[PDB]
Amino acid sequence: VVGGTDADEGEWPWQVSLHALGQGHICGASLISPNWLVSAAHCYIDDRGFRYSDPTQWTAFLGLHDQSQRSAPGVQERRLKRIISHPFFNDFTFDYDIALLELEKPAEYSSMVRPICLPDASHVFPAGKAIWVTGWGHTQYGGTGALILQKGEIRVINQTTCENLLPQQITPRMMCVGFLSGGVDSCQGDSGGPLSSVEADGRIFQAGVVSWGDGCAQRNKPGVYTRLPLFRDWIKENTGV
Numbered sequence: 001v002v003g004g005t006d007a008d009e010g011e012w013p014w015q016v017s018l019h020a021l022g023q024g025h026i027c028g029a030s031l032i033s034p035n036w037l038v039s040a041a042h043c044y045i046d047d048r049g050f051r052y053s054d055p056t057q058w059t060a061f062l063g064l065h066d067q068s069q070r071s072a073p074g075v076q077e078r079r080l081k082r083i084i085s086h087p088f089f090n091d092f093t094f095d096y097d098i099a100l101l102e103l104e105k106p107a108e109y110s111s112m113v114r115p116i117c118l119p120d121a122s123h124v125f126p127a128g129k130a131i132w133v134t135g136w137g138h139t140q141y142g143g144t145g146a147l148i149l150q151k152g153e154i155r156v157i158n159q160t161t162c163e164n165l166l167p168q169q170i171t172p173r174m175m176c177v178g179f180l181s182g183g184v185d186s187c188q189g190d191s192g193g194p195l196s197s198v199e200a201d202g203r204i205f206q207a208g209v210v211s212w213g214d215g216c217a218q219r220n221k222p223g224v225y226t227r228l229p230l231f232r233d234w235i236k237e238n239t240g241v
């Protein structure tokens with residue numbers, strides 16, 4: 001996260017860190033039930049030197065605050081049993097950039113580990129609404145990851161504006177969130193994490209999944225996120241949640 005601040009400890013109890021064996025933190029995810037996380041499909045693609053698509057190569061840390069203190073009280077370590085990438089995910093366009101991760105053993109809810117609420121398929125996160133992005137990704141483009149979880153406030157951008165800022169790249173599954181002036185944005189390593197939106201009674205709903213961007217925090221280049229309402233039924237069908 002660029003232009004963000006240190007989260008308070010336990011402020012985002014749905015935020016999860018995904019470590020690939022021998023590589024440390026790679027992506028974020030969100031806790032949605034005792035057994036399931038939401039993340040980005042692009043995190044789980046094999047490359048010539050590592051099988052990121054193999055669930056056995058991962059470890060999820062729930063209740064984490066500082067990457068250097070992964071054994072702190074309240075942090076829960078879990079392995080993955082399965083990774084369900086959306087069938088329509090396109091690794092070139094990043095359309096349908098969403099995945100479901102099944103924990104090998106259920107998360108134990110606590111003050112530090114709690115699921116985020118999922119929005120109904122008909123819910124619209126309106127243009128202009130303030131929402132939060134969180135993660136341990138880079139704090140500057142080409143920079144370095146954050147040890148302490150970061151948070152940043154960004155706003156939903158009008159879809160027509162989004163499409164015009166990133167020509168031939170924005171599909172209806174995507175949403176731009178940030179500022180045309182730049183300054184605050186997600187970045188490498190924040191992928192897969194949730195956008196958190198404060199709703200009518202203060203409860204937090206997931207608005208989207210960190211997906212991609214052209215650089216980070218640059219003017220006229222807000223981050224691109226996978227929308228969540230569109231996938232409510234897909235999540236229910238594949239997880240029971």
Ligand SMILES: N=C(N)c1ccc(Oc2cc(C(=O)N[C@H]3CC[C@H](N)CC3)cc(Oc3ccc(C(=N)N)cc3)n2)cc1
Binds near residue numbers: 026190213214
């Ligand atoms: N500014 C933002 N809001 C932002 C958010 C998330 C980010 O993380 C990313 C993004 C992308 C990415 O797709 N970036 C652009 C897509 C459009 C292309 N024409 C140019 C590149 C690739 C990419 O590379 C990876 C990294 C890791 C994996 C993996 N774990 N398998 C895969 C791709 N990471 C970057 C920026």
